[PDB]
Amino acid sequence: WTATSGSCKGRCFELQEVGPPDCRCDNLCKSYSSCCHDFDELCLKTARGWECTKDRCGEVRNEENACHCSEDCLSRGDCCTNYQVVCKGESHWVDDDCEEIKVPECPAGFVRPPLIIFSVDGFRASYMKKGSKVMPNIEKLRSCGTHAPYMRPVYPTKTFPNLYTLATGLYPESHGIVGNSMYDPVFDASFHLRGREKFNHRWWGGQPLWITATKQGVRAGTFFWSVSIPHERRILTILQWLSLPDNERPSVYAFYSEQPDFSGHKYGPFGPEMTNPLREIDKTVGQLMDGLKQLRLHRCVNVIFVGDHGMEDVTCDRTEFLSNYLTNVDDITLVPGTLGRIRAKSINNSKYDPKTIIAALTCKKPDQHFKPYMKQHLPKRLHYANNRRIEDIHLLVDRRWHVARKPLDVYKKCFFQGDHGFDNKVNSMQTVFVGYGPTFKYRTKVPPFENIELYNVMCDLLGLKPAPNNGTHGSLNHLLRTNTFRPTMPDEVSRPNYPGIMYLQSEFDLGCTCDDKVENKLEELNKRLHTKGSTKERHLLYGRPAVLYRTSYDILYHTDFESGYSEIFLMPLWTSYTISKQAEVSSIPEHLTNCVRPDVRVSPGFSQNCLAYKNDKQMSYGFLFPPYLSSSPEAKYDAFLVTNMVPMYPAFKRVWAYFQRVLVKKYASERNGVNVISGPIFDYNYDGLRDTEDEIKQYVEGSSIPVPTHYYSIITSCLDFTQPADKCDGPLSVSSFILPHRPDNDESCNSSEDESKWVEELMKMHTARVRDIEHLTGLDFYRKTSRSYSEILTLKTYLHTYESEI
Ligand SMILES: *[C@@H]1O[C@H](CO)[C@@H](O[C@@H]2O[C@H](CO)[C@@H](O[C@@H]3O[C@H](CO[C@H]4O[C@H](CO[C@H]5O[C@H](CO)[C@@H](O)[C@H](O)[C@@H]5O)[C@@H](O)[C@H](O[C@H]5O[C@H](CO)[C@@H](O)[C@H](O)[C@@H]5O[C@H]5O[C@H](CO)[C@@H](O)[C@H](O)[C@@H]5O)[C@@H]4O)[C@@H](O)[C@H](O[C@H]4O[C@H](CO)[C@@H](O)[C@H](O)[C@@H]4O[C@H]4O[C@H](CO)[C@@H](O)[C@H](O)[C@@H]4O)[C@@H]3O)[C@H](O)[C@H]2NC(C)=O)[C@H](O)[C@H]1NC(C)=O
Ligand SMILES: NS(=O)(=O)c1ccc(C(=O)N2C[C@H]3CN(C(=O)OCc4cc(Cl)cc(Cl)c4)C[C@H]3C2)cc1
Ligand SMILES: [Ca+2]
Ligand SMILES: [Ca+2]
Ligand SMILES: [Cl-]
Ligand SMILES: [Cl-]
Ligand SMILES: [Cl-]
Numbered sequence: 001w002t003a004t005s006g007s008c009k010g011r012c013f014e015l016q017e018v019g020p021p022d023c024r025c026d027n028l029c030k031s032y033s034s035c036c037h038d039f040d041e042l043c044l045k046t047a048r049g050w051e052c053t054k055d056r057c058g059e060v061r062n063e064e065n066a067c068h069c070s071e072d073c074l075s076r077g078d079c080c081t082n083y084q085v086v087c088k089g090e091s092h093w094v095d096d097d098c099e100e101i102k103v104p105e106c107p108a109g110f111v112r113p114p115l116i117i118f119s120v121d122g123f124r125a126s127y128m129k130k131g132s133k134v135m136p137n138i139e140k141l142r143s144c145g146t147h148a149p150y151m152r153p154v155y156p157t158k159t160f161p162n163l164y165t166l167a168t169g170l171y172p173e174s175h176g177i178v179g180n181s182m183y184d185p186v187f188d189a190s191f192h193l194r195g196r197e198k199f200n201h202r203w204w205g206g207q208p209l210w211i212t213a214t215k216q217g218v219r220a221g222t223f224f225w226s227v228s229i230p231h232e233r234r235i236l237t238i239l240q241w242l243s244l245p246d247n248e249r250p251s252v253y254a255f256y257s258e259q260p261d262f263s264g265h266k267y268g269p270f271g272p273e274m275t276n277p278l279r280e281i282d283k284t285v286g287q288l289m290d291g292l293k294q295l296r297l298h299r300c301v302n303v304i305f306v307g308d309h310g311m312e313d314v315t316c317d318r319t320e321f322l323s324n325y326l327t328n329v330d331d332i333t334l335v336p337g338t339l340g341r342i343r344a345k346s347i348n349n350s351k352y353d354p355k356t357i358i359a360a361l362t363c364k365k366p367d368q369h370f371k372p373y374m375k376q377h378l379p380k381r382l383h384y385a386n387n388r389r390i391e392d393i394h395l396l397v398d399r400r401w402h403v404a405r406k407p408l409d410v411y412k413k414c415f416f417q418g419d420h421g422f423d424n425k426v427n428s429m430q431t432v433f434v435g436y437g438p439t440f441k442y443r444t445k446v447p448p449f450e451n452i453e454l455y456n457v458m459c460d461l462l463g464l465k466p467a468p469n470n471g472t473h474g475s476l477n478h479l480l481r482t483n484t485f486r487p488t489m490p491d492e493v494s495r496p497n498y499p500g501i502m503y504l505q506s507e508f509d510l511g512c513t514c515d516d517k518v519e520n521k522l523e524e525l526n527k528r529l530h531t532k533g534s535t536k537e538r539h540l541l542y543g544r545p546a547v548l549y550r551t552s553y554d555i556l557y558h559t560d561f562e563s564g565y566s567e568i569f570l571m572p573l574w575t576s577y578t579i580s581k582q583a584e585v586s587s588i589p590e591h592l593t594n595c596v597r598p599d600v601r602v603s604p605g606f607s608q609n610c611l612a613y614k615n616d617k618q619m620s621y622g623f624l625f626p627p628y629l630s631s632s633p634e635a636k637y638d639a640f641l642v643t644n645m646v647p648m649y650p651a652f653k654r655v656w657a658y659f660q661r662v663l664v665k666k667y668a669s670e671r672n673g674v675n676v677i678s679g680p681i682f683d684y685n686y687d688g689l690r691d692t693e694d695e696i697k698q699y700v701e702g703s704s705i706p707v708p709t710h711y712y713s714i715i716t717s718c719l720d721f722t723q724p725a726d727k728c729d730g731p732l733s734v735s736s737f738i739l740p741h742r743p744d745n746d747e748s749c750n751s752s753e754d755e756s757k758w759v760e761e762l763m764k765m766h767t768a769r770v771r772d773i774e775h776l777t778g779l780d781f782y783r784k785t786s787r788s789y790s791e792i793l794t795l796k797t798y799l800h801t802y803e804s805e806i
């Protein structure tokens, strides 16, 4: 109920929300159907339009007008945005030369530069170049301020998950808005686009920027706008708020535009009809900048121009139907479209079987345009599993396609030419970022980055302490002239042991064998040196990784590689080695095929054993440092140490062996040497975070050897590839992956073919940031470089996407 009989007199676009059943006058009252009876009359005036004309200049003030061109309007803060241009001979902001804003130039009483977030729905990254001719205001913001060539949204690349990620710094799995449509099985409630459940606070997790600001004594404009409020009025409302007295004035504001998303759905990302929406958004930006200029704030306010996701070509005819795969289509519920989410129609149906559903959806048609996954098997870079609102069964849909349950859903529910939602590494899904103002840099281009990073920056811009979030604070310091956040490296928690030779061979009863009993003063002293770390500078290029949790581990040195061996997990947490451009690949000699060697530095009790693998019919083993890349026949024996061995399904060994035998050398050749750090990951509860020992669900049969869920590698080289990886003077270049450790290669439909046809493709799909690996291992990399720490943080957030040029 709402007692709409109250009035909005002097309350238009009030900032505090008034509780029911009292009628509201804030920018969201329309969507709640709760506005006072006179809200339209008083607060949504439209008379005489949005622009001053010559004849209106110096007019007598008429409070009925949408905006004013009277002499008192600047004092009232309610002039039309083009007032000084039409009436006072001033220029539009866009026509002014761009001039560096070296310091804030703010009117008296302004305690800090305000922040205005200008958010545009569906603004695809390539619009910035492709539409530059019809967007002069945006092009000026872009060229004069700080811009990225694109900004990566979160998955799924839908509106609500991305807007709320921008506001919180959180992945959707953490903030809880995991789709535009959701079912929460604990609430037994559905969240829908059209409805009033979606406004229940229980759906929205984390802490959005306006709350962060308010808790820390910084006032915030109301971020959401009812669709019926015209853009011109949103802009006028923001400008009016900016004219409030110091103690009442907010420091952070948001504008939202439903365009170009709205038209992009109808006409496709580059339909001829898309030009007009782009022009209109630019016009709105112009109104804001003109308005700021009138208020003498155009060199005071920081403006962020940011989108939520892009837009792809998608038509009705490119739809896959689950009814063409499944017999029991009426036993399931599908969230359809540019992603698929599947769960049982009824919880009382004991014949529903996820395993049989997945199988029926796996590699069934040659040109199949979606791929099914149990959510824990989705690429870890998506961070899309740790939430009960995410259905166990997920469909990753190919770009340009849809999935639906049955054909009748498509024609009885073509009406559209564009859509979005796909994998967030897809080029068409990329969106935009521009920062302009005293706190941003001048005419500066920065590399692409992820939208989860922005919350920290916005907190920096406002002098706020960010709530805990998924950004890496400091990784975007290079966007800022000032207000940088200067983080310190995490303190190492566990210090390593450095064992020497402490065990005789006969003390081991591991069921392992090796033909290594064939054998100086030249090379016996030499190999002693190698075991003490004499080659460590070459193979450990950026310092030992720091272990950020309490554990027991040993640093083990070898000629060709160095490792941090966990006595708890019975295997390395990391193995580090450098492969020069000149390195040669060798084979594993016939007589060494099944060779495994006890490590006399490590107790039998803290070693794996070969008998466990012999007995486990499903599990084999691999090596972290590849025997193929040994520097010499003698050094090769080190690669067969029991302390370099890890459990691997035969199916996975196909992948791993090709990576180690073929791809590492290829990368060294292409990048002028590479440094590789490889290791296991245990994430059985799919939270993106390292498992403790008691969370491990699978062991090698009969043993305490834990089975990794994933294997990672971090591959680093010199950004300037004219310098070898091991002699790099400047910035670094990295690519990483987190490969699922799976007992089949069902994920790869072409796996029956030679590895050269499918393995690298698999790895690219599982590309990762060093930061993702950090979360999953409790390790901290790049501790010892000549680079600034903020630059290293940027490097750790880098994702190698393998997409073509934008
Ligand atoms: C990305 O960044 C985020 C943010 O940093 C990371 O997410 C964090 O990760 C932590 C580890 O998973 C996790 O720690 C939890 O915290 C549990 C309680 O947390 C609740 O309260 C939070 C804070 O309240 C806020 O609000 C008040 C004002 O009202 C403020 O004053 C505060 O300052 C806070 O801002 C709240 O944020 C959190 O929200 C989640 O749950 C809500 C529903 O209740 C959702 O609305 C919301 O969306 C969040 O949901 C996400 O996270 C939950 C997990 O919390 C997850 O289930 C969802 O799927 C979704 O992903 C909460 O309401 C606390 O109970 C935990 O402690 C357990 O574990 C420790 C381990 O040491 C045990 O020692 C301890 O005993 C306890 O175990 C007990 O319970 C177990 C299970 O019942 C049981 O087995 C055991 O026997 C024990 O009984 C733990 O500390 C953070 O909550 C989490 N924060 C957020 C925002 O998600 C994330 O990891 C990052 N991602 C990556 C990859 O890096
Ligand atoms: N993707 S789609 O199906 O085409 C699709 C297309 C359009 C809509 C739609 O009209 N909305 C209108 C609603 C009002 N909103 C708004 O004012 O937000 C401002 C904002 C900025 C920032 Cl920086 C963070 C946050 Cl938290 C919020 C966004 C909602 C969404 C919804 C869906
Ligand atoms: Ca959107
Ligand atoms: Ca985990
Ligand atoms: Cl969705
Ligand atoms: Cl296979
Ligand atoms: Cl542990």
Ligand SMILES: [Zn+2]
Pocket: 122, 159, 261, 262, 265, 420
């Ligand atoms: Zn849309």
